[PDB]
Design a protein around this ligand. Sequence first.
Ligand SMILES: *[C@@H]1O[C@H](CO)[C@@H](O)[C@H](O)[C@H]1NC(C)=O
Lengths: 49, 48, 48
Amino acid sequence: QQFGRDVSDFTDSVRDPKTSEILDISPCAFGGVSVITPGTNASSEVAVL
Amino acid sequence: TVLPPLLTDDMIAAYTAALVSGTATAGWTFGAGAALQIPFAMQMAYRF
Amino acid sequence: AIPTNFSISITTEVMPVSMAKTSVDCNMYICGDSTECANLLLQYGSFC
Ligand SMILES: *[C@@H]1O[C@H](CO)[C@@H](O)[C@H](O)[C@H]1NC(C)=O
């Protein structure tokens, strides 16, 4: 074997072709951004989720 | 296509007739639990 | 006929109240974060 697939057919597992060291692939980082505000009437400072 | 339903028309009739005969000889008791033998004017007296 | 003795009984019923609330990022779904996909995606606007 050379490469693993996940429970869906994306390659998440790579064995190094040079050292035969088998490595997981993670995603880089992604997600969502939310904003916390008390109201523009109330302040100008925010918190970010 | 169209498929016929499971619960057929005469079944649909015979489940409906037992809604009538049991209302006509047991009344409130027909639905309240075990159906109980009783006169129909007594059932009306219960309802009224 | 009038009931003389009786019983009691507990029955159960079950009914959902919520759902697995999800979310789909478009870039890691319709693109896979290729630069090519994001630039034809502007031809569809803020559909996502
Ligand atoms: C909210 O804004 C109004 C004017 O837009 C201002 O008069 C009011 O003082 C503000 N509220 C607070 C709590 O400062």
